[PDB]
């Protein structure tokens, strides 16, 4: 495996590895970075609470 450490909070959205998505069905949106296949990090507080 190889963890991608070349991402910052201001990286451009490539539609593949770094994107902005919606949590559950609520209208909240947040930025996520794919670090390894199928595992993402959302450097933000949890929207649900």
């Amino acid at each position: 495996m190889k963890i991608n450490n070349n991402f910052n909070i201001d990286s451009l959205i490539d539609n593949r590895d770094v994107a902005i998505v919606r949590g559950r069905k609520t209208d909240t949106f947040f930025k996520v970075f794919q670090v390894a296949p199928n595992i993402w990090v959302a450097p933000e507080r949890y929207y649900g609470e």
Binding site: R22, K25, T26, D27
Partner: protein, 561 residues
């Protein structure tokens, strides 16, 4: 700071509520809708009936925003059946283009030889904000977003069902009255400007949807649709007409100044930049009969007989009116007059009338040596010259009022740049009018005589608005006071305002207007309606009385349907 047309000349503006009522009456909008979206093995359906559309706040410039409420709809989200609430709606964004169409409108005030252009949505439609909820609040944000996508697909697919015609325009139509071709658009455009309320609600009344158009083949290389929002808010009228000051000056002030016989057709130069009409070369103002009994030519320097717009007032100015008065004495007089075009309610009709506003301003400059050497003697001739400009005629008066005015005249003498200067402000003019001893009835008699002689001059005036130099010399060679010449010029200038007062040689029509302004006979004169007709014959809304008229950077008229 004020109303600006950003390159356009004519403008017709309405409120959002008026356009919404036009749509309601026309009823040329789709009612039943069936939006379908199919993607990623998922199908979404929104089948129902729309309510009456409303054009609300949110539209600016090219953007046009419409509110589409939903009467009742059924939502099928991959088999999930939901019933929408009665408060659900969408806000669609469309644009307007004057598509050419077969002629159907009639212009009784035009020759109907132009082409009919109807405002329609271009070929797309996007939705900005929506509200889609069920009767139990069980919808999700992603469900609503998917339904919004389906609605967008419907509106792009089903834009043709909205066969509503927003406006009608006649392009390149020759006016039935040839003199008023400035009231027939040549290049047209539209604009939108929406203003929110204090409670953050769409203002269907204060918001302004306009339609700008150039006239008389004026080239506009910058087609812009921005509209000043305060054009209607000040008027508080459902509809408004707007005529640019440049057209008010280059096609009206030229006629007024040329018809005054002070300048000829080849001695007038238009100046858009300074918004002033004057003389390119030295001209003659009239014949002067001083106290010496010798006829004197009243010569005006170039660029001094000014006619412009200042402080929302038609301003007429004279400068450097110099000649030899006697015994080698020269003095210079300067005059400034302010007039306002107001609207008067007479006999239940709205009649535009030009009336005096505030008081004029006077200046007089002379050499120090004349004052120090021959102050007393030259004052008699100066008085004989000046009293004409005030009274409108050169008639002598008692010496008691002469001394009463002379103490004030000598009080206001100052020494600037080695020259004696005196200034007469607004208060001194009304003081002179009160102390003159001439009743308003005598002034009205003078006005009647000047109106008759101005009708005679208009008979001498050719079609172009000028008079031949031979006939000008024939008319001017008659000995007449300079004050009466000022009155005659003012009468001719005011008579030339009939074009902005009534629409449709022009000498006999001017004589008809003179009869209307001297005997109060408007039986054959519709009043402002004809002018309003010229503003509605070519700009026909899908159907009014005009009650507001003013000038705020633009000749502005307000009316209610």
């Amino acid at each position: 700071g004020d109303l600006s047309l950003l390159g356009w000349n004519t403008e017709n503006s309405v409120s959002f509520r008026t356009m919404n009522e036009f749509i309601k009456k026309d009823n040329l909008y789709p009612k039943d809708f069936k939006a379908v979206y199919s993607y990623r093995k998922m199908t979404f359906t929104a089948t129902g009936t729309f309510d009456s559309w409303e054009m609300t706040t949110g539209a600016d410039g090219r953007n046009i925003r419409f509110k589409c409420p939903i009467k009742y709809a059924v939502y099928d989200l991959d088999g999930d059946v939901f019933n929408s609430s009665t408060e659900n709606f969408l806000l669609i964004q469309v644009d307007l283009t004057y598509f050419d169409s077969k002629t159907t409108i009639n212009d009784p005030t035009g020759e109907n030889d132009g082409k009919q252009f109807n405002l329609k949505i271009k070929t797309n439609v996007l939705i900005v904000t929506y509200n889609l909820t069920d009767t139990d609040g069980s919808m999700s944000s992603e469900d609503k977003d998917f339904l919004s996508l389906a609605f967008r697909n419907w509106f792009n697919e089903n834009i043709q069902q909205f066969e509503q015609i927003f406006a009608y325009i006649l392009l390149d139509e020759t006016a039935k009255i040839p003199e008023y071709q400035w009231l027939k658009p040549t290049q047209i455009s539209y604009g939108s400007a929406s203003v929110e309320t204090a409670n953050d609600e769409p203002d269907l009344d204060a918001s302004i949807f306009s339609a700008m158009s150039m006239v008389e083949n004026n080239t506009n290389s910058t087609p812009s649709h921005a509209v000043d929002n305060r054009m209607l808010q000040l008027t508080k009228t459902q509809a408004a007409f707007g005529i640019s000051f440049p057209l008010f000056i280059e096609h009206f002030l030229k006629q007024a100044l040329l018809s005054s016989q002070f300048i000829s057709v080849d001695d007038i130069v238009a100046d858009i930049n300074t918004l002033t009409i004057t003389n390119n070369k030295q001209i003659i103002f009239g014949k002067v009969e001083n106290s010496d009994g010798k006829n004197v030519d009243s010569s005006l320097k170039p660029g001094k007989l000014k006619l412009s717009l200042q402080n929302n007032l038609i301003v007429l100015e004279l400068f450097d009116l110099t000649w030899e008065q006697g015994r080698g004495v020269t003095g210079h007089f300067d005059f400034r007059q302010e007039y306002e075009l107001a609207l008067e309610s007479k006999s239940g009709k709205q009649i535009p009338i030009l009336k005096v506003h505030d008081e004029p301003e006077i200046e007089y400059y002379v050499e120090e040596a004349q004052w120090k050497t021959n102050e007393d003697m030259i004052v008699s001739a100066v008085v004989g010259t000046v009293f004409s400009m005030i009274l409108g005629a050169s008639m002598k008066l008692a010496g008691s009022a002469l001394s009463k005015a002379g103490k004030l005249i000598r009080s206001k003498a100052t020494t600037i740049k080695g020259r004696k200067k005196i200034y007469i402000n607004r208060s001194n003019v009304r003081q002179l009018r009160k102390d003159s001893g001439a009743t308003e009835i005598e002034l009205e008699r003078i006005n009647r005589r000047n109106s008759s002689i101005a009708a005679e001059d208009a008979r001498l005036i050719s079609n172009n608005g000028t008079t031949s130099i031979q006939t000008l010399g024939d008319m001017k060679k008659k000995p007449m006071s300079t004050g009466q010449r000022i009155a005659i010029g003012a009468k001719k200038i005011a008579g030339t305002a009939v074009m902005f007062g009534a629409v449709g040689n022009f000498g006999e029509m001017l004589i008809n207007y003179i009869n209307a302004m001297e005997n109060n006979d408007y039986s054959a004169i519709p009043g402002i309606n004809s002018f309003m007709q010229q503003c509605i014959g070519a700009m026909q809304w899908p159907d009014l009385k005009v009650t507001f008229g003013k000038l705020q950077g633009i000749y502005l008229l307000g009316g209610t349907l």
